[PDB]
Design a protein around this ligand. Sequence first.
Ligand code: CA
Ligand code: NI
Ligand code: NI
Length: 501
Amino acid sequence: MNVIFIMSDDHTSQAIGAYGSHLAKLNPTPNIDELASDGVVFDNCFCTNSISTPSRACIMTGQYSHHNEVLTLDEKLDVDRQYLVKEFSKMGYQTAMVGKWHLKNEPANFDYYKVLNEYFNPTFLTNEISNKEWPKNQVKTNGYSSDVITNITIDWLKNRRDKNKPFFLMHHYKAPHDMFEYAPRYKYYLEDTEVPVPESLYNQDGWGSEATRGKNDSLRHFIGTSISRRHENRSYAEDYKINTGDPKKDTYEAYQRYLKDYLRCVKGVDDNLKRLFDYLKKEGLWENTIIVYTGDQGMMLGEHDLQDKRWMYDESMRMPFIVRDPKSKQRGVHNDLMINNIDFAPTLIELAGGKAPKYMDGKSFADVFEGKTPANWKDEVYYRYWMHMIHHDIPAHIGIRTKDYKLILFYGRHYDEKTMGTPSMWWLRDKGSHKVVQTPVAFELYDLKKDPMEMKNVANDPEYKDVLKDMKVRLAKLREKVGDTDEKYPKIKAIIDNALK
Ligand SMILES: [Ca+2]
Ligand code: NI
Ligand code: NI
């Protein structure tokens, strides 16, 4: 069967109606919900490292960041590590890459590519041009990027695809990534509707730890960019220049404007999927094509007064992940198996008739689509955010999540010693940027059954003493087992080993 892998940049699970959040009553994604109504919604799909380039490298390689080497936004994925597409090509698929490309090197292992690397009249690099090589093979387009990107894929399917060969197509939207430049036809979408506000926008009593707030909350203006003006250097309230005279009203108005601009970008993607899905039905591909819809990671939409991703908190860590397999009987169902973006490539390869590659860290959960739990499937996932402080003043951390608990260890250092001591926000160099410095080392523990919104860090609660001890052992063992043991980074190894002992 064919495969279309659709991924939107920073499309978080709260903003898909099928995940049933407080936003779902706005019906933000009717066409994604219709896809979900005939497929599987995975409730427990997590990235291992919540930023665009690392997550996409995990998808492409089936490997953890410390193996594929894409630790942060700053790194590139080697061409010869484009494993997912190389495996499909080896099964005789024609391969195509369309849209937003974060992996920096040429998509050279794709038969066809037309990529960004721009919200209006985007320019693409594409090997449809004969007399120019990457990165000079550029083509200008007219119009809004979500509409243009959808047309590139439909035009490829209609006019270029070899109709006698199966295809593997990665279809990547730039929306709804910052700066949420939505198409002007959506300017008044939601204009008169209040976006539901999470109570954690204002109430953070019990959330976090000394690692994320400082002793005596001494670092709340330092760690974690904000919706409110809590963070002294970067916030939506300041960026939007909202100044009503009431800081809670400022926070409310910045939240509303953030969420509405974001949901207008989501709406543009969802409307374009109607056009793509209608084409696939008309062309006769709907019943022989596996369709995946996912976001590369989640996003904090103001929960706990936080923004962006990177955090291991569930809104950022969880990826929306919807699969419609037309040969499966799992249609209109949810599945709670604990899965990672590193599992996507082996699962897709098996769903397309191949064998899970043994050099990958991830494993195939393809059995789910036959109504069976895969053999010896993990009940915990590992998480690590490496990019200490840069851009959003979020400290580096590792963690483990089960179905029942999440344990986070903030180790609060950058792995690159030369980066320690630099400004975290380059645009505020010599304008008061915080510096990339050691932040407090602490654990956070969340009881996910009683406290799914992660409002209450119970790491220091006596009632949770045994759970904490057990979770630290589980974290220490998983980290050793996946090989993320920091021999290259002695200062961090010492912090983490000492904290887990
Ligand atoms: Ca992203
Ligand atoms: Ni990409
Ligand atoms: Ni787009």
